[PDB]
Amino acid sequence: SNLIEVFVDGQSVMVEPGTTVLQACEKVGMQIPRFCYHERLSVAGNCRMCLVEIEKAPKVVAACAMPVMKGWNILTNSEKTKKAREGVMEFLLANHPLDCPICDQGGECDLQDQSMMFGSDRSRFLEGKRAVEDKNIGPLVKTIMTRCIQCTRCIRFASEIAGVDDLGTTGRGNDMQVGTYIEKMFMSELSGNIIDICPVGALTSKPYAFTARPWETRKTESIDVMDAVGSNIVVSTRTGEVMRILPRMHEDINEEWISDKTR
Amino acid sequence: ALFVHRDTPENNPETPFDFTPENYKRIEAIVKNYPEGHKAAAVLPVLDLAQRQNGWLPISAMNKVAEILQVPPMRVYEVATFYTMYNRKPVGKYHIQVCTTTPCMLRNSDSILEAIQKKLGIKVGETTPDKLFTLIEVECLGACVNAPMVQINDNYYEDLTPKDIEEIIDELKAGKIPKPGPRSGRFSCEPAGGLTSLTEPPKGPGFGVQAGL
Amino acid sequence: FDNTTYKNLQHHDYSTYTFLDLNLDLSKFRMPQPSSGRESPRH
Amino acid sequence: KTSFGSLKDEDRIFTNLYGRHDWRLKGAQSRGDWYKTKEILLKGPDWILGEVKTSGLRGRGGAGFPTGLKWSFMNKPSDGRPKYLVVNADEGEPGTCKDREIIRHDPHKLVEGCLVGGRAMGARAAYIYIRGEFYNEASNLQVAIREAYEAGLIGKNACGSGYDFDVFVVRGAGAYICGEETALIESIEGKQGKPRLKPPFPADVGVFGCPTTVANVETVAVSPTICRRGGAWFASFGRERNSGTKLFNISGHVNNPCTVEEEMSVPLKELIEKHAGGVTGGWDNLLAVIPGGSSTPLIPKSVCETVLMDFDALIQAQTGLGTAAVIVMDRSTDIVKAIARLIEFYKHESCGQCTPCREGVDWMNKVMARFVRGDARPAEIDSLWEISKQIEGHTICALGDGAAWPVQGLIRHFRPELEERMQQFAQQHQ
Ligand SMILES: Cc1cc2nc3c(=O)[nH]c(=O)nc-3n(C[C@H](O)[C@H](O)[C@H](O)COP(=O)(O)O)c2cc1C
Ligand code: SF4
Ligand code: SF4
Ligand code: SF4
Ligand code: FES
Ligand code: FES
Ligand SMILES: [K+]
C-alpha cells in the first residue's frame, strides 16, 4: 500500500514511510548498538554508536535518526560499520573511569556489553582522564557523574516523560556536564526511572547501593500493589531476600516505567 | 572556571536584581522580533541586556530572565554556561581579552600578553585589586589581518605593539577612553604602504546594468 | 573625490545601549509577527 | 582564459572595502546600491534564481555549495508556515575576517542582498546573526537598516514592489560553533548552539521549525550586483565551476597583512606577492600556508609555488578554499606549535554534543601538546592519524572534520619534523 522496500544486508523489508534505519533493522531481527537512542524518548543522535553504512553511500548515517529511503541496502556488519563502532567505543571509553568493580552497573552495563561485542579489546589512550564533581539530587538517585557519557537520556526523560525541566547540560565541549547547575533535588513521582534508562553507572539506586550483582539475583515477574494501576514489575531476589524492584514492560499499563513508591 | 553554581552571600537567589524601567521597554522590543509562541528566542539578547545593566550575571539575574520569558530556569542556566561572553563572576571594569589563536600568535600576541601582565601586575584570568581590569585570553576575534589585537569591553584595538597596549591601559586607567582601531598607521584592513586596489573612484548608479532591466 | 580619510568614525561614540536603542527604534517599522497558535510549546 | 588575478576596480563589487567612502545610505546609493531594486523584485523569484544559477556563485562561508541550487530549495508553495532567510555573520573561522568589512563598510549591500535573496526564497524576513564580539559592526548594520526602513527600501511595500520584508539583527554571545548553519538556527531559538542532525534540512524544518535558508554574508551581499549586472558577467571571472570574484584575507608572516578582493583562480603566489607585499623575509622564507581558514589543511612551500586559489584547484592539492583566509607561515615558525594551537582552538569550540568531537578532539589536543615537546614516540603519529580518521565523517557537524583536517595536513607534509622533536626529546631525557 504505502509501504516501501528497503534491504537489510540484502533481505527485503517493507516499512512504513518515516521508519528509521534502526527500526528497519529491528524487523529483520537485528539490534543496532545504541546509547543515546531510547524508543520512548525523542531522538537525539548524539552518541553516534548507531552509525551504519548504506550501500554505495560514502558516509555512514546515524541509524536511530535517519529515515530509510526506498531501495536502500543497510550493511549492518560491513567493515565500514564495524570500524565506526570501534571508533565510537574508543572515544566513549577514553575518559570513562576504571570503576567496574565498585560500580553498581557492573554486570548489567550497556557500556560493558557493547564494548565486548562491538568495541576493540584494548586501549591506546595514553593521557589522563576527565573527572567531574558529583551532584546531589535527592535521597533516591546517587550520582557518580564521572561515569556519565553525555547521552542525555535523563534530560529527555525528565522533560518529556516526567514533565520536569530541571536537568540539562552546562558547559561546553569535553567539559560539558549533566546536572541541575544549582543545588536542586530531582524529586518526582517518576524520578527513579532515570536509574533504569541511564546506560551507565552515573545514576544508580541509592537504597540498592552495593548490595547485589545482577548475575546472582533471581527474577520474579509480579504485580505492583502500591496503587490501582497494576504496574507490571520484576522482583529481584537473592538467597531468599528481596533486593530491588524493577519495571516490567507492559505497553497497555505502565510501559517500562514505575512510580517511586513502587520502586 | 566551574559550571556548577554554589550559593554565596554575593551570589544567591536573593541577590537583588531587576531590570530598570528603560530596560523593560528594550526587552519588549527584543521579544517583538520573534514569532508569537516562540518567546524563548529572546533568551540570549535578554541575558546580554541583564549583563549590560549589571556587569555580570548573578544567579538571581538568570532567574529573572527565566521568569520574564516563562522558560524553565534550567534552560537559561544552559545558555549562560554555554556562551563565553556571559560573565557568571564579577569582572573588572575593563575586560581585556587578548586573542592568542594562530594568526594573532604568528604576529606576536605573546609580546602583547606579557606587556599587559607586567603593566597591571597580574596573571591571565585575574583581576587587579582596584577591580578595574580583568585579563583573559580568547580565540579568534575576527580581526586577524590586524593582528595582534585585543578587545576591551565592546572595542577592538589592533596592530598593537607592547608600547601601544601600555599606552591604552594608561588612558583607561587615567579616566580617558582610547580610540578603537589600528594603532599602527592604517585605518582598517587595507595594506600598509598604499592601497593595492580601490584607488579609482567608484562607479555611479546604473553602471554595468545588464540590458533589459 | 577623496580617497585618503576614514569615513567610518561614528562608532567611536557608540555606547552600551546603542544596539538595543536602535532595535527599540525600529520596533515601529516591523510587520506583525506570525503566530504558532499557542502561547508557547508548553501550552 | 588561462590566467587570473588582475581584477580591475570597475569589476569589483565591494567598492567600499576599506571604508574610505560614506558607508551610509547616501554613499551606498552613490555607488550603485539600491539601484533598480524594485525592477529586480518585480522580475520574480524564478528570474532571480535563474540569474544566481548562471552566475556560478558558490557559498563563501566555507563549504561552497552551488548557491543557485541551494536557494532553489525554497522555491516551493507556502505550506502555512512563514519562510525565513538567515544570514550568517558569525564570521568565526580563525584567519577569516572578510565579512567584518562588508558589515561595517558596505551594510547596504548586505541589506539589499537580504531583500533580493529573500524575494527569491519567498521569505517574509531576514534574520542576520552576527557574532556578539562585533558590537560596533552590529551597530553600524543596525543604523543602515534604520535608513533602509526610513526610505521605504524595506518594510511594507519594500522598494515599492508590493513585497513586505523585514531585516532583524540578532547578536551571538561567544561561540564559534554558532557559525554552523543548524547551530546558528538553534542559537536564534534561544537554545545552546548545538547543531541539528540532517534530515530534516533547513529548507523543510529550519528556524522556529519553518523553511529556512542560511547564507553567508558574502554570498548574500554579491547577489544584488549579480542580478543588476547579470550572471553572465559574474561567471566571466575565474575558472569554470569556480566563478566570480572572492574576498581574500592574507595574515600571518607577510609584510602587509590585508583584506583584498580578487578574482577566483588567481595563483596563491601572485595574490600574496601583489597585495600583501610578499612573505616576510622573501618568498624563499615560506614554510607553509593554510589556504582557507584554520579548517583547511596546510600546504608546504613547494605546493604553494603554483597552486590556484579556487575550490577545485585547492581540492586537488589535498586541501580546500574554505573561506579564503590565507595564513602564511615562514621558516621561523614552530610549525607543530602553530597547528597545536589550532587544535586547542577546536577543543574550546566543540559544543560537546556528539562523542567523536567531544572526546576525540580533546584527545588530539592532549597528543598535540606532547608532540610540541617531542614527549612522544614515533608510533603515536600513525595512532593520531587513525584517531583523526575516527572523528572525520562520524560527527554531527563539520567542526569535527575541521579539527581532523589540520592534523592530517601536519602529518602529511611535516612527519619528518615531528619525528625530529621526538629524537631530540629522547636524547635529553635519558
Ligand atoms: C564549525 C563551523 C563554523 C562555521 N562558521 C561559519 C561562519 O562563520 N560563517 C559562515 O558563513 N559559515 C560558517 N560555517 C558554514 C555554515 O555551516 C554554512 O555552510 C554556511 O553558512 C552556508 O552559507 P553559504 O552556502 O552561502 O556559504 C561554519 C561551519 C562550521 C561547521
Ligand atoms: S558504567 Fe559500566 S563500564 Fe562504566 S564503570 Fe560502571 S560497569 Fe564499568
Ligand atoms: S547521567 Fe546517564 S542518562 Fe544522563 S546523560 Fe549521563 S549517561 Fe546519559
Ligand atoms: S562535531 Fe563537535 S561541534 Fe559538531 S555537533 Fe559534534 S560535538 Fe558539537
Ligand atoms: S543511538 Fe544513534 S547516535 Fe546515539
Ligand atoms: S587570530 Fe586573532 S583575531 Fe583572528
Ligand atoms: K544506571
Keyword list:
part of a larger assembly, 4 chains, A: 263 residues, alpha+beta, 5-stranded mixed beta sheet, 3-stranded antiparallel beta sheet, 5 helices, C: 43 residues, mainly alpha, 1 helix, 21% helix, binds flavin mononucleotide, binds iron/sulfur cluster, binds FE2/S2 (inorganic) cluster, binds potassium ion, NADH dehydrogenase [ubiquinone] flavoprotein 3, mitochondrial (chain C), ubiquinone (chain D), transit peptide (chain D), ComplexI_51kDa_subunit (chain D), NADH dehydrogenase [ubiquinone] flavoprotein 1, mitochondrial (chain D)
Brief overview:
Chain A: Residues 80-119 form the 4Fe-4S His(Cys)3-ligated-type domain. Chain A: Belongs to the complex I 75 kDa subunit family. The structure is cut from a larger assembly and holds chains A (263 residues), B (213 residues), C (43 residues) and D (430 residues). By secondary structure, chain B is an alpha/beta fold.
The number of helical runs of chain C is 1
What is the number of beta strands of chain B?
5
Enumerate the distinct ligands.
Answer: flavin mononucleotide, iron/sulfur cluster, FE2/S2 (inorganic) cluster, potassium ion
- The multimeric state of the shown protein is part of a larger assembly
Distance between the termini of chain C: 61 Å
Name the helicity range of chain B: 25-40%
Question: Helices and strands of chain B, in N-to-C order?
Answer: HHHHEHHEEEHE
Q: How much helical structure, as a percent, in the residues of chain C?
A: 10-25%
Name the largest protein-protein interface in this structure.
B-D, 65 and 87 residues
Cα-based radius of gyration of chain C, to the nearest Å: 19 Å
Strand content of chain C: under 5%
How is the biggest beta sheet of chain C arranged? Answer: none
Q: How many whole angstroms does the radius of gyration of chain B measure? A: 22 Å
Strands of the largest sheet of chain B, in order across it? 2-1-3-4-5
- Alpha-beta classification of chain B: alpha/beta
Query: What best-fitting shape of chain C do the alpha-carbon axes yield?
Result: elongated
Modified residues (N6-succinyllysine) (chain D): 53
Protein name (chain D): NADH dehydrogenase [ubiquinone] flavoprotein 1, mitochondrial
Binding site for NADH (chain D): 59-68
Keywords (chain D): 4Fe-4S, Acetylation, Electron transport, Flavoprotein, FMN, Iron, Iron-sulfur, Membrane, Metal-binding, Methylation, Mitochondrion, Mitochondrion inner membrane, NAD, Oxidoreductase, Respiratory chain, Transit peptide, Translocase, Transport, Ubiquinone
